[PDB]
Amino acid sequence: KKIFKPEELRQALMPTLEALYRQDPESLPFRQPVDPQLLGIPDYFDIVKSPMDLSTIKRKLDTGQYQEPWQYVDDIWLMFNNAWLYNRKTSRVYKYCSKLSEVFEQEIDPVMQSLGYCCGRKLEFSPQTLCCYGKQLCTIPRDATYYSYQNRYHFCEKCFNEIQGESVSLGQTTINKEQFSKRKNDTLDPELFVECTECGRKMHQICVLHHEIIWPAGFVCDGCLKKSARTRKENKFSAKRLPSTRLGTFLENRVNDFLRRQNHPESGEVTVRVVHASDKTVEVKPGMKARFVDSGEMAESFPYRTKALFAFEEIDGVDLCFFGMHVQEYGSDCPPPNQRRVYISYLDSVHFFRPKCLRTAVYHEILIGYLEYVKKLGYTTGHIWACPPSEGDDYIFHCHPPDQKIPKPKRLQEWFKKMLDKAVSERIVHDYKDIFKQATEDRLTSAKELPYFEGDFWPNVLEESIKESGGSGSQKLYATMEKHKEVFFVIRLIAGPAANSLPPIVDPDPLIPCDLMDGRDAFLTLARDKHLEFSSLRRAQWSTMCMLVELHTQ
Numbered sequence: 001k002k003i004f005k006p007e008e009l010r011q012a013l014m015p016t017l018e019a020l021y022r023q024d025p026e027s028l029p030f031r032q033p034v035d036p037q038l039l040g041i042p043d044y045f046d047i048v049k050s051p052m053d054l055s056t057i058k059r060k061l062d063t064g065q066y067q068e069p070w071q072y073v074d075d076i077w078l079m080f081n082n083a084w085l086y087n088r089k090t091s092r093v094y095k096y097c098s099k100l101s102e103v104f105e106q107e108i109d110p111v112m113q114s115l116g117y118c119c120g121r122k123l124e125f126s127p128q129t130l131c132c133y134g135k136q137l138c139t140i141p142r143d144a145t146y147y148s149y150q151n152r153y154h155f156c157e158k159c160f161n162e163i164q165g166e167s168v169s170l171g172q173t174t175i176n177k178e179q180f181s182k183r184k185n186d187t188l189d190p191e192l193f194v195e196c197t198e199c200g201r202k203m204h205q206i207c208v209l210h211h212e213i214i215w216p217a218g219f220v221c222d223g224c225l226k227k228s229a230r231t232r233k234e235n236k237f238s239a240k241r242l243p244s245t246r247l248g249t250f251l252e253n254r255v256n257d258f259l260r261r262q263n264h265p266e267s268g269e270v271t272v273r274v275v276h277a278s279d280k281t282v283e284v285k286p287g288m289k290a291r292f293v294d295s296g297e298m299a300e301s302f303p304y305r306t307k308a309l310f311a312f313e314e315i316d317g318v319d320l321c322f323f324g325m326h327v328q329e330y331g332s333d334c335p336p337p338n339q340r341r342v343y344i345s346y347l348d349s350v351h352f353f354r355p356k357c358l359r360t361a362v363y364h365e366i367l368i369g370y371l372e373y374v375k376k377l378g379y380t381t382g383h384i385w386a387c388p389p390s391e392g393d394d395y396i397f398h399c400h401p402p403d404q405k406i407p408k409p410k411r412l413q414e415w416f417k418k419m420l421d422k423a424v425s426e427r428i429v430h431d432y433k434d435i436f437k438q439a440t441e442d443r444l445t446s447a448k449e450l451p452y453f454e455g456d457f458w459p460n461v462l463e464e465s466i467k468e469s470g471g472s473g474s475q476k477l478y479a480t481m482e483k484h485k486e487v488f489f490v491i492r493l494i495a496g497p498a499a500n501s502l503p504p505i506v507d508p509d510p511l512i513p514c515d516l517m518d519g520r521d522a523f524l525t526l527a528r529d530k531h532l533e534f535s536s537l538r539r540a541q542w543s544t545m546c547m548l549v550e551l552h553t554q
């Protein structure tokens, strides 16, 4: 429908093209079509297969060859990427090109918006991290060269040439090095567009938050809606409409009561939902099993319930998932040493909560509420491993904002201490100790007496210890505990004689089958496979919207 008259486009866009022209000397290399031979560069057309330059663009613009403005934008970016492709990162033309692109970014955005568009930005997704089958946690860097096979087996340029000979082994089968692709990790997927069904304008799907399941009749831009005074049909796939639980309700009431007491300007309501609950078992690993299970001194496995929960806030009218946590709950039927214990598997956040100055407070309220809740059920003890994610890894949310800092261990330890200190002052937590002091207090003598949690530090270090010492589970146990003690919190919810005569633990909430949220892996995998990043407010809002559709539909 919306037809851009060629003069309309010329008038609107030509100022953006002049802005590039007016850059001396940066513009000069780009003002005329590259003559490879004159410019003393023969292989140019071996690399650059779709040449483009300012003059060619000016001409297409003057002569009405563009039907819509994104075609102009695409050519501009083709010109830039041609130059970034052919020239070295350190070269003259490269840096000139970079300067032009910055001028362009700033020029083009408000013009595109004048023309009825979401924005005028060129948007691409973050590059995925490439691992290496050659070693355990080797990784391949952005833009550096690497070797791959079937887009499945990749090797860093170092660890690839390490292997003696010309044959690699995958799995087991043998592949000649000549069968690998040599390539640079410089591939970035563009954001997708959706077309207004009325005016025909292409908008970024993430800018307008159009999801085909939620609005199956099709996308209609805000411009077209307002002209006829319409509004979008309600999004029924919201956080609030996910099923309630006793736990979710308890947590969200605690949070919102806290926010109401603070009475900070521009506060929003928080929604907390438990989205997974299932029964699982942790099995004792082979070292510890040989040492204590086979002689009947320790159970071969421990049953627990895992739960996943998330908190959401409305930001700019749209749901935003900002906090996530998975827990392991070992009930009263579980064998010692795990009986009546909870452990936090992992928690994660995306720093867009409003107001900022209450963000940490709100995270604390969620954790204190959770401790209070399980205490009420008759869990006696909480367990926290203060362990920051490894570099550029995510616990729950794929692709954090690059300006969201990740705490080192001392800051994270202090953060948990501040939370627990508030919990103590509220008489929820009786007291808490590091693992070394707690063991001392419990007069612990053997490794079989340490709580054994899925994924936790201690089951792994005990394997290592037994093997290193050639058979002892407990020789350097106190020394290992002392050494790592600042990192391991033991939290006493129910103290002393009362902890010995408790009734059975009965959870009033039902099981909640959701494979997507059975541990952290599935949602990370989904997010990676569907470009659901939490790296900006707009992408997190999109990703939350997609997450909520998945939770509602599956």
Ligand SMILES: CCC(=O)SCCNC(=O)CCNC(=O)[C@H](O)C(C)(C)COP(=O)(O)OP(=O)(O)OC[C@H]1O[C@@H](n2cnc3c(N)ncnc32)[C@H](O)[C@@H]1OP(=O)(O)O
Pocket: 344, 345, 346, 347, 348, 349, 350, 359, 360, 361, 363, 385, 386, 387, 388, 389, 395, 405, 406, 407, 408, 411, 412, 415
């Ligand atoms: C088994 C694993 C576990 O369950 S424990 C591991 C928990 N999970 C993680 O560490 C995942 C990554 N972290 C997060 O999502 C958040 O850091 C969590 C833990 C939720 C807490 O966030 P928040 O309440 O904002 O505290 P915070 O310390 O992150 O930030 C508050 C202020 O400190 C700053 N900060 C953070 N890191 C650094 C740093 N490395 N160097 C310098 N400053 C840092 C932040 O920028 C922030 O500053 P400000 O308050 O905005 O002024």
Ligand SMILES: [Zn+2]
Pocket: 117, 118, 119, 120, 121, 203, 204, 207
């Ligand atoms: Zn846009």
Ligand SMILES: [Zn+2]
Pocket: 132, 134, 135, 138, 139, 155, 156, 158, 159, 160
């Ligand atoms: Zn490697």
Ligand SMILES: [Zn+2]
Pocket: 196, 197, 198, 199, 200, 201, 220, 221, 222, 223, 224
């Ligand atoms: Zn429209």
Ligand SMILES: [Zn+2]
Pocket: 264, 355, 356, 357, 358
């Ligand atoms: Zn404030």
